[PDB]
Design a binder for this molecule. Structure first.
Ligand SMILES: Nc1ncnc2c1ncn2[C@@H]1O[C@H](COP(=O)(O)OP(=O)(O)OP(=O)(O)O)[C@@H](O)[C@H]1O
Ligand SMILES: Nc1ncnc2c1ncn2[C@@H]1O[C@H](COP(=O)(O)OP(=O)(O)OP(=O)(O)O)[C@@H](O)[C@H]1O
Ligand SMILES: Nc1ncnc2c1ncn2[C@@H]1O[C@H](COP(=O)(O)OP(=O)(O)O)[C@@H](O)[C@H]1O
Ligand SMILES: Nc1ncnc2c1ncn2[C@@H]1O[C@H](COP(=O)(O)OP(=O)(O)O)[C@@H](O)[C@H]1O
Ligand SMILES: *OP(=O)(O)OC[C@H]1O[C@@H](n2cnc3c(N)ncnc32)[C@H](O)[C@@H]1O
Ligand SMILES: *OP(=O)(O)OC[C@H]1O[C@@H](n2cnc3c(N)ncnc32)[C@H](O)[C@@H]1O
Ligand SMILES: [Mg+2]
Ligand SMILES: [Mg+2]
Ligand SMILES: [Mg+2]
Ligand SMILES: [Mg+2]
Lengths: 568, 357, 568, 357
C-alpha cells in the first residue's frame, strides 16, 4: 500500500499552482519510490527548455540517509545540460528517467539568499524545499541566467571520467603570453609517473612539430629524478570547447563541431599528426591529447592563465570520448586551504639540529609555505629516537639531515631543500660562504657550545637569530630572537637562567636500555609536537616584527598553555 | 702592597659583560646598516668607536643607568660650504627608518637607546683636499681604527695601517707606530654645542698617547684613572661638580710619572705630584693651562672655574693624607680599612640551566 | 716557547703531594701539548694496577673546543682495561701513550657527590678538576670498587666495532626459562634486512642442530614481510664473556680462554658446526656467531633476561675479532624515553576519519604506546590535502585508511594496525562483529550523519565514545566524551551549540582551485598539530577517568590556550 | 474544537528529548552492568522499565528538577526465607562500584542520580515454583517486557512473548494479547515502606490495560491524563496535596468512556461522569473503593483521606463549569482564553554549529 507520507507529497504537488500530476507512486525493484509530474514556467520559454517540462521525483535510502532527487523524463523531459546539473544522458534500461538531476543544493546568484534559506529534516518539508528550488532552477535555466557576474567559472561535467587517473601540470600567470601567440599550433609533450602513487602522471616538457624543446617545467628534486617519455600531443584553442549551453562534447563528431565553430579542423590536425609521426622515426605513437585554452576565475573578468584538458587518443566517429582529469600544481594553487604570509615565504631558512624539535618545525614550515630550507646535522638516526621524531624505520642508519631533507622534498611539488652533513662550524671556507647565503638562522640543538660557536662566527651581514629549547620533562619552552650581525649569547643565557624552570632530578631519568650507562631526558611525542607548533607560530611572529624578543611558555595539567614575556 | 685586593676592587668597578657584548654588537650593526644605506653610501667614509670605552677608562654606573658609548662617523663633505645643521639633518631619514622611536638629537650629537647601553654619535668631516685626503681615508679604513676591542684586551695595538690583530692558539712581528708626519698635523672638523660653527678634534692621537702611557707604566694608568673616578663618585658631597670626564683623565695622566710599579705607590705618587705642581696656582686662586694631545692650540681646562679647581685641590690633599698613612701601615687589615675609607665598600678586606632538544 | 698556562700546569703538578713530574711540555705535529707525569696511590696496590703509574696529559683543539685527556704511558703505564675507561691498546706509531683514557666525566658511586662537584671553564681549573678525578679513579680501580651495588651493568668496550652495522633482536622476561635449560647447546638462526634502512639486520627465528624450529619472533606487519636467510649460529653461555677485570677479548685465543674458564671448548664447537654443515646439504655457510647469556640491569640484582652478542665468523689464531653491535627491540626497551600509562596501552582503539586531525592523532597514539588501532575511511587522498596532513605525495591516489595504516605500521617494531575501507555503518554483519571488538571509539569526521549513525548502531556492550572537532578558522576545539552502550547525540549537539564559537563567513573561504565551485575551510598545519596534541592528552585523561565530560578550547593571538569546561 | 491548539499544548507539556535519550541510555547501561556482575549473575533475572514513563503519562517538571524514572529488577530469590532488608543489602557493592557517590537508599527503593534524570529501582521476587516460574521467567525475558520505548511510540505493542517490534521503510502480522490464564493470576512480591514484610504488585497488567484503553479511545487517554495532571499543577493553591500520581490516573481512567472523538469532548465527558458517579459519596463525606488492575484484592485509594476527596470533587466541579462554557463557545479566541483559564499560559491562542575535521 502507498504510505501516508507519499500521499501527502502527492497532495502537495497537486495543490501547487505551477505543478500538476496524474500518475501515482510506484515501488521499484531497487526500493525506490517514483512519481511523474509536470512543471510550468513563468518566463518566456527558450529553445533549449520548453515551458511544460516533465520530471520524476525519486526517493530511496542507502544506509541511513534518504535521497530525494528529481530526474528529467526520458520521453518528454529536458535534453540539454545546463550549469549546476549533472550530464543528461539517456541509457538503454528499464528506467523511465534520465541522469541529468539538477544540483539544487548549489546556490547561484539568481537564487535569493532568503529564498534559499536552510534545508529541513522531515521528509515532507525536504520535499517542499526541493520542489521550490527546482522551480527556481528551471526558470533560471530558461532565462540563461544560471551563471552571472561574480560567479565562479565551474568546468562542465564530463561524461565517463575515470575516478582514478590524474594528470598534473604547472601553468602560471607569467606563462600566459608565451602560449598566446601559439593559438592554432600543435606539438608533442612528455610525461612522468609519480613514484609510489596510484594512477598519477605529470607533464615535464613541451616540444614542437619537429621535436625541439620550447619550455621545461620546474619540479621538486624528488620529482625531477624520473624517466621522461614523449607520449602526448598539445594544441592551443581560442576558447573552452563547450557546447551550448554548458554541455561537454561526448562523441568525436561534437568535438569536431566545436572545433569548426572555433575556426579549426580536427581531421586536418589528425592527418598532420600522422604525417609527422611517420616522418620522425624515433616517435612511436602518442597516447593522449591535450587541449589548452585561456581561462578566467570569475565570470566578467579577463583570462590570466592557460588550462589544459586531457583525452585518451576518428574525428567522424560516433564513439564516446574517454576523458582524464587534470590538475594545476602551481605554487599558488597548492595551499589554497591556508598559507603563511609572503614575508616569511620568501626567506631562506637554515636550521641547526635535525633531532626531535627541529624535524617537526621543518616539516611544519615546509607544509605552510617556506620552501628554501637548509639542515645542519652530523649524527645518525637510531630506533629509539623514533619514539619522538618525524621519520620512520626506513631512515635508520642514515645521517639525520639527509633523511629529513628527502622527507621534506617528498611533501609538495614546490619544495627545494638542501642538506649539510658537517658540524657547526664548517671547516671549509666554501661551506662557510654557502651558509652565509641564508637570512634566518634557527637553533634547535639545546647545546651551549653551538651558542658560543654562533657568536664566534663571522656572518658578514645582518641576520635574524632564533633559539628554541625545551625544559626538563618538557614542562616549558624557551624562545629567544634577535636581529644583529652577531649572536648575543650572554643575554640569552641570562634570560634562560632568570626564567622559573623545573630542576633536574635523576630519579625520573631512565637509562636508555640494558647494557648501557647514560640516561635520557623524559619527553613524550605530544609535548614535542605542541612545542613545535608554538615555536613555528613564534618564528612567524618574529619574522613579521624583528627585534630583541624573549618568551617562556609553560604547560598546565588541565591542558592549557601560559606565557611569561620579558620587557626590555 | 695588598695587590690582590686592589685587583678585586678593579674587577668590581668595571662594566659588566652583558653591556660589553651589547655595545660591541650595536657598533657593528650600525656600521653595516650605515654602509648599506643608498642615500648616504658615498657620503659616509668611516664609523669608529672612541671615548672612555675605547680607552678602557670607564666605570660601572650605579643603578640601572645605561653606559655612554661614543661613536664617530667620518664623511667626505666640505665644511666650507655646508652648515653643521644641514650635515646633521642629512641623517634623520636613516634614524627614522632603522631606529623608530629610539633616537633623540641633543646638542651636537645623536643619542640612540639600545637594550643595555646608549650610543652617542657625532658627524665629522675631513678638512683636507687631494692626495692628503686619500691617505687620511685609507688610514681611517684600516683595522687599527675599525676595531671594537678596548685597549686592555689589545696590548699590542699600534696606530699603523699595516697592523693586524695578533691571535695565537694559546698566547707575530710587532709593527710600531706610524711617523707623526702622516697623521699628527691632520685633524678633523666637528660641530660645536650650538651647531653654528665647526671646531677641530683629533681622537686618534689621544688613543695613541693613552696606549703609550699605559705601556710605559706597566699597565696601571687606566686602572688608576678608574680608581680616581670611583673615588670622585664616592665622595660626591664634599667635591665640586667639575672636573669630570676627559679633563679629569688628562689631569691624572699629567700627574703620573713613567715607571709605575704597583697601584698604591702610583696613587701616592700621583697625589703628591699633583699637590707639588699646582701649589702656586692654588695659592693664587687660578686654574692650570693644559694642551690637548691632538690639537696643540686648545686648552682642555677651558670651561673649568677656579673655585672648582681649588675644591678639587683640597679634596686631593685629604685623599693624599689618607693614602700616605695607608701605604705605610704594615698590618694588612688596618691598611685595607684605610683604603676602604676612600674607595668605599667595594674595596675587599683580606649556574647553567638545563636545555634539551 | 712554552706558554704561561702550561707552566702553571707544570707548577700545579709539581706542588701536588701525590704527583711528580720531570719532563717538560712538548708540541706535536698534530698541535697537541703533552706532559709525562707519575702518580701515586694511598691504598694497597693490586696486581692489575701498580702504585707508581705513569700517565701523559694531552691538550688539543678541534674546532672551538679544547680537549684535555690523560692517557696511559706505553712503556710504564697500566695495561688492563677497567670500568669507566676506553680500551687500553698500544699501536705501532710514534705516539708515546696508549688509547686507554679513563672516562673521568662518568661519576661512579665511590666518587663522592661533593667531590665530583661541577666542571669549571678556565683551562687551569679544568686541569685541576681532571687531575683530582684521575686520582680518585685510580684509587678506586686499585680497590676494584669502580662498580658497586646500585650501579648499572655497562657492557665492556669492544675493540674495532663498526659504527654502521646493527643487529636487532627481541628477548623478554618470559623467554628466560626457555633458554635456561639450553646452556651449552648450539644451533642455527636466520635474519632479515630492514627495508630502506642502511646497514641494519634483525633476527627472525631460531633452529636446532638438525634444522627444526624451536622459537619464532613476532614483528610488525611491515617487518614480517621479508626473506628469511639462515646465516647465524647461536650458543648459550653461563656468564658474560669478559676478561679480568673488565677487558673484552680481542683475539680468538682470549675468547677460547674465557670459554675454558666457563667450562666449554671453542674448537669442539667449531668442529661440530663444520660437521653439521657438511651433513645438511641445504646449509651453505654461517656468517655470524651469536653468544647468549643471562644479564642483570643493576649490580646485586638477579638475572631476568638473555642478552645476545654478535661477532663476524680459528680458535687458536691471534687475529683480531670483528664485533657487531646488537640491540634489544623488545616492547619495554623501545619507549624508555617516555610512554603512556598501561590503562590506555592495553585498549583496542577505533578511529573514524583518516583526514587531517585523525591521522595526526593516530600517529601520536602509535608513537606513545597504543598499538592496537583500526581506521575507518572510504575517501581518496589528493595533493591539496597534503597542505594539512600526516602523509606525503607517495600516498596520493590511495584510500586514506590503507595509507595511514601502512605509515603507522612503519613506525615501531611493535605496531599492529588494521584498515577498513567501508563507510560507517558497514553493510556486512561480519564487519559489524569485527567493529564490535574495540573498546574506545573516536570520531574525527566533523559530520552530523556519522553522529546519528553512531547512535543508531548496536554495540552490544559498554563503550567509551570520544568526539573531537575544530571550529571555523581553527580558532577552537570541541571535545566530548561519554561511557555508555549507546552514543548520546542530543547532549553532544546541545553542548556544541551552547559553546561560544566564531561565526562562518564566506569571505575567508577560498575556492579549492581554478575551474572549481566548492570552497574549503581555512586551517594551517600548525593549528591542526596543536589541536591534535591537545586531543591526545584529552583522550588519555578521559581513559584514566571515564565519564560524561565536555570541554572547549580556544587559542589566543599571543600563543596561549584557554579552556572552558562544563559542569554536569 | 480547536484541535491544533490542544496538540501544541500537549507538545509543550511533554518531557524534553535530552531527558528521553538520558533515561533510555541509562536503563540500557544499567541492564548491561547488572548482567555482567558476577556476584549477582544468577540472582538477577530481569530489569525492566515501568511507571508513567513507560505508560506515557508523565509531565515536564517545572524548573531544573530531574524527572523520576521507575525501574524494576526481578530476581529468583525465595521471599519465604529472606527478609527484604537482606535482599536490598545484596546490591550495595554493585552500586558502590559502578555508581560512586551517586546512589541513595530511601524507603523501599534505591535512587540513582544521572546527568538529567533520576532512576528509582525496586527489588522484586517471583512467588511461584516449578514450571510456572520457568514460564514467568521466559515471559519476563521477552522483547515485549524488555523494550525502552513508551506506549505512544509503539501503537502495535501487545503483551505476548511472540511479539516483535514492527519496523517499516516508511510506515507485519499483528499478534494479539496473551490469554489471562498465563499471566493474570501470577503477581510478584516487593518490599513495603518499612521493609518489614513483602507485598504484592503486578505492573504488566497495568501497562496492558493502559494500552487497551488508549486503543479503544483512539489515542486520547494518555494525553487527557497529562492535561489533568498539568491542571492540578497549575491550580495547586486551591487543591489538596492528594490524590496525585497513579491514583489520579486510575480515577481518570475509571471516569472516561470508550470512544473518545476529541480532547475537549473527552474532558467534558470525564468531568461530568466523575461528578455523576461520586455525588452520593461526596454528600456522605466518604471516599470511593477502586480495585487495582493487577491485584483484585487491593484498593488504590487506600491512603486517601475523605477531606482530600471532597476538595478534589469541588475543584473538579469548578473545572467542569469552565470546560462546559468553553466547549459551547463558537468564537475561537474566546474559547481559547476560556481554556487558558484552567490549563494556563502554555495553552496557545489561535541551529547547527559548524564543525570541521
Ligand atoms: N674638554 C675636552 N677636551 C678635549 N677632548 C675632549 C673634551 N671633552 C671631551 N673630549 C673628547 O670627546 C670624547 C667624548 O667626551 P665625553 O665627555 O663623553 O668623555 P668620556 O671620557 O667618554 O666620559 P665618561 O667618562 O663620562 O664616559 C672624549 O673621549 C674626548 O676624546
Ligand atoms: N497506590 C498505588 N496503587 C497501585 N499501584 C501503585 C500505587 N502507587 C504506585 N503504584 C505503582 O508503582 C508505580 C510507581 O509509582 P509512582 O508513585 O512513582 O507513580 P507514577 O505514576 O510513576 O508517578 P509520577 O506521575 O509522579 O511520575 C506506578 O506506576 C504504579 O504501577
Ligand atoms: N663627542 C665628541 N667627540 C670628539 N671630540 C669631542 C666631543 N666632544 C667634545 N670634543 C672635543 O673636546 C673639545 C672641548 O669641547 P667643548 O668643551 O664642548 O668646547 P666647545 O663648547 O667650544 O665645543 C672640543 O675642541 C672638541 O673638539
Ligand atoms: N515502585 C513501585 N513499583 C511497583 N509497585 C509499587 C511501587 N510502589 C508501590 N507499588 C504498589 O502500589 C501499591 C500501593 O503501595 P503503598 O500505598 O505504598 O502501600 P504500602 O504502604 O502498604 O506499601 C502497593 O500494593 C504496591 O504493590
Ligand atoms: O633533542 P636532541 O638532543 O635530539 O637535539 C640535538 C640535535 O642537535 C644536533 N646538534 C647538536 N650539536 C650540534 C652541532 N655542534 N652541530 C650540528 N648539529 C648539532 C644533534 O645532532 C641533534 O640532532
Ligand atoms: O577535516 P576532514 O573533512 O578531512 O575530515 C573528514 C574525514 O572524515 C571521513 N569521513 C567523513 N564521514 C565519514 C563516514 N560516514 N564514514 C567514514 N569516514 C568518514 C572523511 O573521509 C575524511 O577523512
Ligand atoms: Mg663617554
Ligand atoms: Mg658622551
Ligand atoms: Mg514515576
Ligand atoms: Mg517514583
Amino acid at each position: 500500500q502507498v504510505p501516508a507520507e507519499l500521499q501527502a507529497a502527492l497532495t502537495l504537488i497537486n495543490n501547487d499552482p505551477r505543478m500538476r500530476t496524474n500518475n501515482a507512486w510506484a515501488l521499484s525493484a531497487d526500493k525506490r519510490w517514483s512519481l511523474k509530474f509536470t512543471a510550468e514556467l513563468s518566463v518566456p520559454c527558450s529553445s533549449f527548455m520548453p515551458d511544460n517540462s516533465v520530471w520524476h521525483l525519486v526517493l530511496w535510502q542507502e544506509e541511513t540517509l534518504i535521497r530525494i532527487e528529481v530526474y528529467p523524463d526520458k520521453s518528454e523531459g529536458i535534453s540539454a545540460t545546463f550549469q549546476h546539473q549533472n550530464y543528461n544522458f539517456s541509457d538503454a534500461s528499464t528506467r523511465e528517467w534520465t541522469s541529468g538531476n539538477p544540483a539544487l543544493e548549489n546556490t547561484p546568484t539568481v537564487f535569493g539568499r532568503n529564498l534559499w534559506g536552510l534545508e529541513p529534516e522531515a521528509l515532507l518539508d525536504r520535499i517542499s524545499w526541493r520542489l521550490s528550488r527546482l522551480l527556481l532552477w528551471i526558470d533560471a535555466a530558461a532565462q540563461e541566467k544560471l551563471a552571472t557576474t561574480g560567479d565562479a567559472v565551474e568546468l562542465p561535467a564530463f561524461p565517463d571520467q575515470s575516478p582514478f587517473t590524474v594528470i598534473g601540470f604547472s601553468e602560471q600567470i607569467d606563462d600566459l603570453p608565451f602560449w598566446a601567440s601559439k593559438t592554432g599550433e600543435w606539438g608533442f609533450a612528455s610525461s612522468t609517473g609519480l613514484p609510489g602513487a596510484h594512477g598519477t602522471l605529470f607533464l615535464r616538457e613541451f616540444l614542437d612539430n619537429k621535436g625541439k624543446l620550447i619550455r621545461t617545467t620546474k619540479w621538486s628534486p624528488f620529482m625531477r629524478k624520473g624517466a621522461r617519455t614523449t607520449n602526448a600531443v598539445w594544441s592551443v584553442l581560442p576558447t573552452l570547447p563547450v557546447l551550448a549551453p554548458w554541455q561537454a562534447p561526448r562523441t568525436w563528431q561534437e568535438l569536431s563541431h566545436c572545433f569548426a565553430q572555433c575556426g579549426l579542423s580536427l581531421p586536418d590536425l589528425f592527418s598532420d599528426i600522422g604525417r609527422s609521426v611517420r616522418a620522425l622515426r624515433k616517435q612511436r605513437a602518442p597516447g593522449l591529447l591535450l587541449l589548452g585554452f585561456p581561462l578566467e576565475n570569475k565570470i566578467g573578468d579577463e583570462p590570466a592563465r592557460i588550462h589544459w584538458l586531457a583525452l585518451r587518443l576518428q574525428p567522424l566517429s560516433q564513439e564516446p570520448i574517454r576523458w582524464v582529469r587534470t590538475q594545476n600544481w602551481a605554487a599558488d594553487q597548492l595551499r589554497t586551504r591556508g598559507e603563511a604570509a609572503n614575508d616569511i615565504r620568501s626567506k631562506k631558512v637554515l636550521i641547526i639540529g635535525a633531532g626531535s624539535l627541529g624535524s617537526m618545525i621543518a616539516e611544519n614550515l615546509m607544509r605552510i609555505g617556506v620552501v628554501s630550507q637548509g639542515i645542519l646535522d652530523a649524527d645518525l638516526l637510531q630506533t629509539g629516537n623514533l619514539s619522538r621524531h618525524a621519520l620512520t624505520m626506513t631512515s635508520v642508519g642514515h645521517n639525520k639531515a639527509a633523511a629529513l631533507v628527502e622527507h621534506l622534498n617528498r611533501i609538495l611539488p614546490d619544495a627545494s631543500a638542501r642538506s649539510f652533513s658537517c658540524a657547526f662550524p664548517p671547516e671549509s671556507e666554501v661551506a662557510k660562504n654557502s651558509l652565509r647565503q641564508y637570512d634566518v638562522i634557527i637553533d634547535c640543538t639545546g647545546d651551549d657550545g653551538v651558542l658560543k660557536s654562533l657568536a664566534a662566527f663571522d656572518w658578514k651581514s645582518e641576520k635574524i637569530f632564533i633559539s628554541l629549547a625545551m625544559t626538563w620533562r618538557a614542562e616549558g619552552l624557551f624562545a629567544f630572537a634577535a636581529s644583529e650581525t652577531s649572536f648575543p649569547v650572554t643575554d640569552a643565557s641570562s634570560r634562560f637562567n632568570a626564567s622559573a624552570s623545573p630542576e633536574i632530578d635523576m630519579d625520573e631519568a631512565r637509562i636508555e636500555g640494558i647494557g648501557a650507562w647514560h640516561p635520557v631526558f623524559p619527553a613524550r611525542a605530544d609535548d614535542v609536537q605542541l612545542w613545535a607548533a608554538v615555536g613555528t607560530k613564534f618564528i612567524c611572529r618574529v619574522v613579521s616584527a624583528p627585534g630583541r624578543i624573549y618568551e617562556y611558555f609553560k604547560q598546565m595539567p588541565d591542558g592549557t598553555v601560559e606565557k611569561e614575556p620579558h620587557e626590555y | 702592597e695588598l695587590q690582590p685586593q686592589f685587583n678585586e676592587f678593579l674587577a668590581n668597578i668595571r662594566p659588566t659583560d652583558t653591556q660589553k657584548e651589547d655595545w660591541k654588537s650595536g657598533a657593528r650593526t650600525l656600521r653595516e646598516r650605515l654602509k648599506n644605506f643608498e642615500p648616504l653610501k658615498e657620503i659616509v667614509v668611516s664609523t669608529f668607536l672612541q671615548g672612555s670605552i675605547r680607552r678602557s677608562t670607564a666605570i660601572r654606573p650605579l643603578g640601572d643607568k645605561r653606559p655612554d658609548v661614543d661613536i664617530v662617523v667620518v664623511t667626505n663633505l666640505d665644511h666650507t660650504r655646508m652648515s653643521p645643521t644641514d650635515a646633521m639633518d642629512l641623517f634623520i631619514p636613516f634614524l627614522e627608518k632603522y631606529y623608530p622611536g629610539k633616537w633623540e638629537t641633543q646638542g651636537r650629537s645623536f643619542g640612540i637607546t639600545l637594550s643595555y647601553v646608549e650610543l652617542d654619535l657625532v658627524i665629522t668631516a675631513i678638512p683636507e683636499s687631494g692626495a692628503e685626503k686619500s691617505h687620511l681615508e685609507q688610514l681611517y679604513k684600516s683595522e687599527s681604527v675599525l676595531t671594537v676591542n678596548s685597549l686592555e684586551e689589545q696590548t699590542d695595538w699600534r696606530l699603523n695601517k699595516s697592523w693586524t690583530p695578533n691571535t695565537g692558539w694559546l698566547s707575530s712581528a710587532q709593527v710600531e707606530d706610524a711617523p707623526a708626519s702622516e697623521w699628527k698635523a691632520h685633524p678633523l672638523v666637528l660641530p660645536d654645542r650650538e651647531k653654528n660653527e665647526w671646531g677641530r678634534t683629533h681622537p686618534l692621537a689621544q688613543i695613541r698617547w693613552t696606549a703609550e702611557k699605559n705601556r710605559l707604566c706597566n699597565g696601571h694608568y687606566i686602572n688608576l684613572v678608574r680608581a680616581v673616578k670611583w673615588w670622585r663618585q664616592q665622595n660626591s658631597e664634599d667635591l665640586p661638580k667639575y672636573p669630570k670626564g676627559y679633563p679629569l683623565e688628562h689631569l691624572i695622566g699629567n700627574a703620573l710619572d713613567n715607571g709605575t710599579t704597583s697601584m698604591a705607590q702610583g696613587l701616592v705618587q700621583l697625589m703628591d705630584t699633583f699637590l707639588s705642581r699646582w701649589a702656586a696656582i692654588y695659592n693664587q686662586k687660578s686654574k692650570p693651562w693644559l694642551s690637548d694631545h691632538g690639537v696643540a692650540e686648545h686648552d682642555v681646562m677651558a670651561r673649568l672655574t677656579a673655585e672648582d679647581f681649588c675644591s678639587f685641590y683640597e679634596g686631593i690633599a685629604s685623599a693624599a693624607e689618607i693614602a700616605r698613612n695607608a701605604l705605610a701601615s704594615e698590618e694588612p687589615q688596618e691598611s685595607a680599612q684605610l683604603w676602604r675609607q676612600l674607595f668605599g665598600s667595594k674595596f675587599p678586606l683580606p649556574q647553567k640551566t638545563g636545555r634539551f632538544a
